[PDB]
């Protein structure tokens, strides 16, 4: 089975920039290689086939080439509609195999997050469970470290994270962290804190509430 190694897996670039994605074949595939694009809505479209032939209607800014075992897709100048996921696919033999993929995201200036902490509601406490949520709003880059502390004691294994897709307007990200505890465990402690670390913050920011439940 022929393996396709795609690099890089992630790429941050500005509008108008020239970028190149590469796929290395473990065996000779003799120009048999296609490139696909997947938009954030799940739509998949063929861009190139036979290594360098464009699909009808595809912008001429896209091009493909070969150098040894390496096959590349080059976008001469990035446009807004080009920020998506890309995959190469070989069809020289069976089974057909895909490259790992490359996510191309929009690069912008560093933006520090706005941090908010939410105590559980009285309504939820009646069901015997308590969810504490920490929100990180509109930041860039995506990398952010969230640490939970109850009575200044670090937590682990009891939190869940969820992050939004890059915003169409400002190109920022938003992240939420949820700490889940039993009503019993929740009622045996005082301070609940959310410590946030990010490139745009000189020192970690901390948000807490003491006794809140409404």
């Amino acid at each position: 089975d022929i393996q396709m190694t795609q690099s890089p897996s992630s790429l941050s670039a500005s509008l108008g920039e020239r970028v190149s994605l590469t796929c290395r074949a473990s065996q000779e595939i003799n120009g048999y290689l296609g490139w696909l694009q997947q938009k954030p809505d799940g739509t998949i479209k063929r861009l190139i086939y036979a290594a360098s032939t464009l699909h009808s209607g595809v912008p001429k800014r896209f091009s493909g080439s070969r150098s040894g075992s390496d096959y590349s897709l080059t976008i001469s100048s990035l446009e807004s509609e080009d920020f998506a996921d890309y995959y190469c696919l070989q069809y020289a033999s069976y089974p057909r195999t895909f490259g790992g993929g490359t996510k191309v995201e929009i690069k912008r200036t560093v933006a520090a997050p706005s941090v908010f902490i939410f105590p559980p509601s009285d309504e939820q406490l009646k069901s015997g469970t308590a969810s504490v949520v920490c929100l990180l709003n509109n930041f860039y880059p995506r990398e952010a470290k969230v640490q939970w502390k109850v009575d200044n004691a670090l937590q682990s294994g009891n939190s869940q994270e969820s992050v939004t897709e890059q915003d169409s307007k400002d190109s920022t990200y938003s992240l939420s962290s949820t700490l889940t505890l039993s009503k019993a465990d929740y009622e045996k402690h005082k301070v609940y804190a959310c410590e946030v670390t990010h490139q745009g913050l000189s020192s970690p920011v901390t948000k807490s509430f003491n006794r809140g439940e409404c």
Partner: protein, 217 residues
């Protein structure tokens, strides 16, 4: 125009089987040549196999040899993907593609779980713990313990769209989903503007409207 139409979403229990379909709207036997691809949540594309009805040939990736079976109905220009002895590892979106990858289907979501359909509990994420105003405030709704997804969340019946962030759902250890929708609003409006999240979960026919008030706690 000439396209690939796929069947709807499927929800089954582990151990069972499913049969998905992909019909070529406006094609022929030469175009009943179809590929089937798998995509797990937040992961890459995986080739399952392909059918070439003109030569009654079918090829699969070794990893799917026991799991999948592709058949084709040349009269209706439809191919079928049969998946057996399902496990959680089979929960994904399945796509179909034509000869040379010229046309691609919209995808069919398959969810494998032993959980039953359940509506969500909606809890408020009240603004402030005691602090009176501050510039820009944040509030929201915690949409917890529902199955299966999706769930739709709007604010003020669609009137408030600016500053809204509805997060992708997460699968909890109970086998149930959860997500939160937040919105940043001016601190000055907290005592005079009404904020209400409208949650709709079609699978269970649950419509819940929750007013988020600054209880200051």
């Amino acid at each position: 125009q000439v396209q690939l139409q796929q069947s709807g979403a499927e929800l089954v229990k582990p151990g069972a089987s499913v049969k998905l379909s992909c019909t070529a709207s406006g094609f022929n036997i030469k175009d009943t040549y179809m590929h089937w691809v798998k995509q797990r949540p937040k992961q890459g594309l995986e080739w399952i196999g392909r059918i070439d009805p003109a030569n009654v040939d079918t090829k699969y990736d070794p990893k799917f040899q026991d799991k999948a079976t592709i058949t084709a109905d040349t009269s209706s220009k439809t191919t079928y993907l049969q998946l057996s002895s399902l496990t959680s590892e089979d929960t994904a979106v399945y796509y179909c593609a034509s000869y040379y990858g010229i046309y691609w289907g919209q995808g069919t979501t398959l969810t494998v779980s032993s959980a039953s359909t359940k509506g969500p509990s909606v809890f408020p994420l009240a603004p402030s713990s005691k602090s009176t105003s501050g510039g820009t405030a944040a509030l929201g709704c915690l949409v917890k313990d529902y199955f299966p997804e999706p769930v739709t969340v709007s604010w003020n019946s669609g009137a408030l769209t600016s500053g809204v962030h509805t997060f992708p759902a997460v699968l909890q250890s109970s086998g149930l989903y959860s997500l939160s929708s937040v919105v940043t609003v001016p601190s000055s409006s907290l005592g005079t503007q009404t904020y209400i999240c409208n949650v709709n979960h079609k699978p269970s026919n649950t419509k819940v409207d929750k007013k988020v008030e600054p209880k200051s706690c």
